[PDB]
Design a protein around this ligand. Sequence first.
Ligand SMILES: Nc1ccc(CNC(=O)NCC(=O)N2CCC[C@@H]2c2cccc3ccccc23)cc1
Length: 164
Amino acid sequence: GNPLVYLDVDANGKPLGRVVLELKADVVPKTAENFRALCTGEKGFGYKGSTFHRVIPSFMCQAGDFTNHNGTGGKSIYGSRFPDENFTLKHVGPGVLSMANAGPNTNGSQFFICTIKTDWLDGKHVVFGHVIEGMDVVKKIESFGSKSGRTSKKIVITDCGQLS
Ligand SMILES: Nc1ccc(CNC(=O)NCC(=O)N2CCC[C@@H]2c2cccc3ccccc23)cc1
């Protein structure tokens, strides 16, 4: 079935707990496979040690720039960027997992988890999963955000991997 992956997240050196995500490989296999491998780190690189660099309360929490560590970078298992697979899944509510981008067909490794329904991103950002467990962790992360997106705590993915 669909992969289940996890992110263990710190805020200022103390553990917040674990976010578990289902990756919808049945709808978006390529996008799901990318996130899966970046979680395990099996290609030699991935999310372990990277940060949530942009967090905006009542919107979303953005992470995954493990190359430049500032929100301009990241890369996929396929190459630096890969196409928008499809826009079949929608940004329906809190807990939606979706790809950040710099316009059409520029998916890399950056992703976000919504804390509200973000319908205006439908057709622009590829939705590829959702939060199975650990929305409390997502809310903690959200609480350390700000209007500009700058975080008030250092939010790090200390460990990540595949559960099934
Ligand atoms: N591969 C790659 C991906 C992203 C980037 C940098 N691009 C972005 O951060 N773009 C914005 C973006 O993807 N998102 C996800 C929802 C959060 C943010 C976003 C998306 C759409 C509207 C937003 C309005 C205000 C603040 C953030 C907005 C560079 C390289």
